[PDB]
Amino acid sequence: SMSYTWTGALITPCAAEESKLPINALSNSLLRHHNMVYATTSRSAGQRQKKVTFDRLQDLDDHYRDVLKEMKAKASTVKAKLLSVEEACKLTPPHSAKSKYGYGAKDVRNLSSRAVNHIHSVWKDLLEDTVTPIDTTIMAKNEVFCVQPEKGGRKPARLIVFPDLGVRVCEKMALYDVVSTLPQVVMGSSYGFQYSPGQRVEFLVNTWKSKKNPMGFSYDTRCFDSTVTENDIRVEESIYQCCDLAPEARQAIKSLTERLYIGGPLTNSKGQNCGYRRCRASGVLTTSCGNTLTCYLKASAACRAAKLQDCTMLVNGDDLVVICESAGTQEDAASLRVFTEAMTRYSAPPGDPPQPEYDLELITSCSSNVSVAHDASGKRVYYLTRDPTTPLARAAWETARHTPVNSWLGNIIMYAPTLWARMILMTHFFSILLAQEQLEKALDCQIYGACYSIEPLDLPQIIERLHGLSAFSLHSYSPGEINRVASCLRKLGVPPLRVWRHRARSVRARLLSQGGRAATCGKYLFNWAVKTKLKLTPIPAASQLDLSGWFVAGYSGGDIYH
Ligand SMILES: CCc1cc(CC[C@]2(C3CCCC3)CC(O)=C(Cc3nc4nc(C)cc(C)n4n3)C(=O)O2)cc(CC)n1
Numbered sequence: 001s002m003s004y005t006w007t008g009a010l011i012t013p014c015a016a017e018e019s020k021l022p023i024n025a026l027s028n029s030l031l032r033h034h035n036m037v038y039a040t041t042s043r044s045a046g047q048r049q050k051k052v053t054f055d056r057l058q059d060l061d062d063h064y065r066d067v068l069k070e071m072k073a074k075a076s077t078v079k080a081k082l083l084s085v086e087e088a089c090k091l092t093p094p095h096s097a098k099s100k101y102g103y104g105a106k107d108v109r110n111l112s113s114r115a116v117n118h119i120h121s122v123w124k125d126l127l128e129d130t131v132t133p134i135d136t137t138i139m140a141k142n143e144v145f146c147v148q149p150e151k152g153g154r155k156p157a158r159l160i161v162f163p164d165l166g167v168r169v170c171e172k173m174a175l176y177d178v179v180s181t182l183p184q185v186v187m188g189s190s191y192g193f194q195y196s197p198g199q200r201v202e203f204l205v206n207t208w209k210s211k212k213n214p215m216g217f218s219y220d221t222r223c224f225d226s227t228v229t230e231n232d233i234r235v236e237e238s239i240y241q242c243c244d245l246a247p248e249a250r251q252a253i254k255s256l257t258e259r260l261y262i263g264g265p266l267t268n269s270k271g272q273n274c275g276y277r278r279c280r281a282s283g284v285l286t287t288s289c290g291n292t293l294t295c296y297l298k299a300s301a302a303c304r305a306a307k308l309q310d311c312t313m314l315v316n317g318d319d320l321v322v323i324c325e326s327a328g329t330q331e332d333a334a335s336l337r338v339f340t341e342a343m344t345r346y347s348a349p350p351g352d353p354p355q356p357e358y359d360l361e362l363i364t365s366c367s368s369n370v371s372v373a374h375d376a377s378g379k380r381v382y383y384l385t386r387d388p389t390t391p392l393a394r395a396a397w398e399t400a401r402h403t404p405v406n407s408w409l410g411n412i413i414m415y416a417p418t419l420w421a422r423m424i425l426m427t428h429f430f431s432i433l434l435a436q437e438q439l440e441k442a443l444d445c446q447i448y449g450a451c452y453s454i455e456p457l458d459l460p461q462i463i464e465r466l467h468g469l470s471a472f473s474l475h476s477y478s479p480g481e482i483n484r485v486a487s488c489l490r491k492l493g494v495p496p497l498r499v500w501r502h503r504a505r506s507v508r509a510r511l512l513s514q515g516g517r518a519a520t521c522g523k524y525l526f527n528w529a530v531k532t533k534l535k536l537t538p539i540p541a542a543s544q545l546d547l548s549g550w551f552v553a554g555y556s557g558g559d560i561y562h
Pocket of ligand 1: 375376418419420422423473474475476477482483485486496497528533
């Protein structure tokens with residue numbers, strides 16, 4: 001069936017959309033080639049519509065059925081519970097889209113009577129009606145990128161499809177516990193969202209080392225959400241139903257599947273019918289879990305079809321990497337074509353075709369790779385990094401323009417051991433926070449799709465707890481990593497190391513001069529910049545720090561605030 005059908009009504013904005021990075025003295029000090037940075041807007045929604053609209057063909061074989069049986073068996077060991085209306089209300093982000101029924105996210109978090117009474121009504125109706133399609137809104141994502149002259153053209157806006165606020169609270173009630181618990185039980189060590197960046201590195205390295213002649217590849221499904229069929233969504237539901245659930249949870253999950261997850265009508269911001277969806281909704285609670293399970297199922301079965309030798313998967317939504325034993329270069333290339341043939345058969349045809357990699361460092365998964373540096377003792381050590389272009393482009397935008405969720409703070413947290421986050425992101429943003437006297441202001445950021453309020457001054461103990469003390473003393477980064485960063489700096493017109501070190505020394509001295517938590521930021525975050533390194537010792541606040549709840553599950557599109 002077609003992933004979408006369209007009426008002709010436009011995907012509309014409801015406010016101004018800015019497409020060009022503004023000229024701003026603060027962002028210019030970070031990167032001067034502002035014309036390389038752009039944001040997606042509703043003006044390219046039609047381009048995206050064309051790309052995501054296609055007919056899906058799917059055939060299922062024994063390998064698929066076998067894997068599915070195994071998955072269901074593990075799922076049958078899971079017990080999940082309903083959230084109360086209050087517990088669900090409290091998971092709603094403060095800036096979550098307001099209801100069309102006369103209330104907003106503040107009213108939900110405040111447990112206002114209008115909000116809470118409406119949520120109750122929505123739930124009752126889910127129980128009473130398991131057929132009528134639930135309305136969704138479709139909007140164009142506004143996201144920031146750098147131009148890629150080599151790829152030929154710019155990225156069009158992604159589309160987000162989401163039901164009303166009251167429905168979203170109901171999804172939490174029925175499914176938050178399931179989507180939080182089930183993926184790891186079903187997929188075990190292959191479920192990527194259980195890992196911090198350090199733990200993902202450890203898994204990838206240990207997995208690579210476990211093969212005699214390792215080969216790895218990432219598999220890029222073309223528009224994954226669009227490839228998800230009604231069968232797939234019903235298969236997902238059948239896995240959820242393997243859990244030990246309360247009778248009302250079972251009914252709510254069935255109703256949500258029939259009326260929301262399988263498909264339904266699409267309404268623009270102006271209330272006009274834009275069309276109909278028969279694929280994954282990008283903005284529901286089950287998007288991440290659903291995609292992860294389905295990607296895992298198809299890939300696992302495809303591994304068996306291609307006769308890949310000792311294949312280990314790492315899956316995060318639609319993002320997939322496979323590490324296995326090489327059978328030789330020609331044999332590996334052929335195997336990857338069979339794997340791709342099988343994925344296609346299962347309705348996950350490829351974007352870029354997979355290519356075998358024999359150096360773990362060159363495998364990009366979840367837009368990131370393993371790299372090497374040295375700690376203070378000189379020990380060669382592994383850490384997670386990525387190409388810094390998108391992080392820097394977004395940091396420039398977020399410097400010039402106030403944004404709901406910043407990405408720069410999440411990037412500092414996740415990529416704290418990297419040379420680019422330390423050299424550029426920490427230096428830039430602490431300089432800004434100093435100037436504005438906003439070091440003390442908590443900021444919203446995202447980790448694995450979930451929103452968190454984080455205090456910049458707590459960054460030293462967060463980083464220690466997450467990455468270890470070595471994060472403040474890594475050095476001797478790989479030539480490839482250094483070169484990748486230097487290329488990006490030239491491309492974006494970012495200042496060189498000499499300038500960031502001078503900036504960092506000044507930021508550091510100011511921080512130290514202020515005392516308290518500010519001084520601890522100066523000492524630990526910027527120790528790299530000074531000639532005479534201080535001895536960094538364990539931060540007491542770090543040993544009372546529980547960050548495990550940050551790396552439980554993915555929630556991208558799922559409207560979660562922790
Ligand atoms: C693309 C810009 C660039 C960056 C770098 C990395 C420089 C830098 C990073 C910048 C941020 C965090 C650290 C700074 C920096 O000063 C060093 C040098 C260093 N720091 C140490 N610390 C200890 C304990 C022990 C040793 C031997 N070193 N050696 C580094 O390796 O990395 C190197 C180069 C090539 C010179 N170019």
